[PDB]
């Protein structure tokens, strides 16, 4: 990967095609990118492909199957406690690689394809250098937090809000991903 | 698609502009007080700062704005008029050194271009290259704050 981290988004389907696809569980669409904007019939969020696996937040995907060209695909991993789930990365996607530098300077990629700076304050916390309204981060759960090199340091899970403005973010560090696989 | 960086020309020369906070900024040494073309006629500069070598008109059509950097990183990246990205280490407020010096020919026509941080956020606007013997070893730039202040 490289820097500066720049990202863009593309919508691939709408509400009706999404509902149909959700039921049939068969999606014939072409897949590209490291992060997929994903949706159930109740909510929409993100899923990040790290090392051949498409990871996302359990509180979003539950135990559901991901719709694929060959019909539904069951999850490879499920960890209610760590709030993780993973499916084999879709055919066409590009995976990110875990961070191996321990940089405290993280960058969150939102569902709007905006990358916002986050200062790591702990294993699963980092503070937004420029806080934003929580409505801005809605739908970004499952999205990546990269180090200056563009490597996955963790997955966005929850926001730390005060009066509707998020000051910090709660994430799932890649270590939990490794652990969830060994489990 | 919408672009953040516009490639402009004045007959005299050609350089770049960068939309930050809805304003299309570029170098005074390129545009001067010139207006920018529009399908409805010439549009005038919203800001002109001869002192800072900074001029800005309202962001044009087919453009999208860059966000100022708020992470402080010293690891900058310059985007040229050819879309080439060049890693630059921040030496100070308006100076940064190329990690791999290039002949000035490579940095030509890029004034006005953005000086991005690791997050693709604007740090400054490429003002002019600082070179030794035809080799651009570093660059001069206008920090975003100057722009945020000019507004």
């Amino acid at each position: 990967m490289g820097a500066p981290i720049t990202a863009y988004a593309q919508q691939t389907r709408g509400l009706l095609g999404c509902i149909i696809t959700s039921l049939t569980g068969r999606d014939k669409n072409q897949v590209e990118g490291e992060v997929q904007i994903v949706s159930t019939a109740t909510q929409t969020f993100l899923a990040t492909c790290i090392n051949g696996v498409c990871w996302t937040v359990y509180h979003g995907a539950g135990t559901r199957t991901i719709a694929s060209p060959k019909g539904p695909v069951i999850q490879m991993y499920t960890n209610v406690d760590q709030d993780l789930v993973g499916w084999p990365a879709p055919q066409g996607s590009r995976s990110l690689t875990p961070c191996t530098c321990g940089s405290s300077d993280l960058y969150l990629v939102t569902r709007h394809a905006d990358v916002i700076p986050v200062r790591r304050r702990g294993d699963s916390r980092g503070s937004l250098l420029s806080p934003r309204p929580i409505s801005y981060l809605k739908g970004s759960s499952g999205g990546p937090l990269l180090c200056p090199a563009g490597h996955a340091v963790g997955l966005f899970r929850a926001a730390v809000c005060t009066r509707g403005v998020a000051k910090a973010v709660d994430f799932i560090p890649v270590e939990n991903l490794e652990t969830t696989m060994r489990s | 698609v919408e672009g953040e960086v516009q490639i402009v020309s004045t007959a005299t020369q050609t350089f770049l502009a960068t939309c930050i906070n809805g304003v299309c900024w570029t170098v005074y040494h390129g545009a001067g007080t010139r207006t920018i073309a529009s399908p409805k006629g010439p549009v005038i500069q919203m800001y002109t700062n001869v002192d800072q070598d900074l001029v800005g008109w309202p962001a044009p059509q087919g453009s999208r704005s860059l966000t100022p950097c708020t992470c402080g990183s010293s690891d900058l990246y310059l985007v040229t008029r050819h879309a080439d990205v060049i890693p630059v280490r921040r030496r100070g407020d308006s100076r940064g050194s190329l990690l791999s010096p290039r002949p000035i020919s490579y940095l030509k026509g890029s004034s006005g271009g953005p000086l991005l941080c690791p997050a693709g956020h604007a740090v400054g606007l490429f003002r002019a290259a600082v070179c030794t013997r035809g080799v651009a070893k570093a660059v001069d730039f206008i920090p975003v704050e100057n722009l945020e202040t000019t507004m």
């Binding site: 389907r13 696809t21 569980g25 999606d27 990118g33 490291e34 997929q36 135990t63 991901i66 590009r94 | -």
Partner: peptide, 22 residues
């Protein structure tokens, strides 16, 4: 329950590019 459906993508691998005049 239904399947989680991919409704869009976010591409980090893109690099600065001069938008094609098309």
């Amino acid at each position: 329950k239904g399947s989680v459906v991919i409704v869009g993508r976010i591409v980090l691998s893109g690099k600065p590019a001069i938008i094609p005049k098309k």
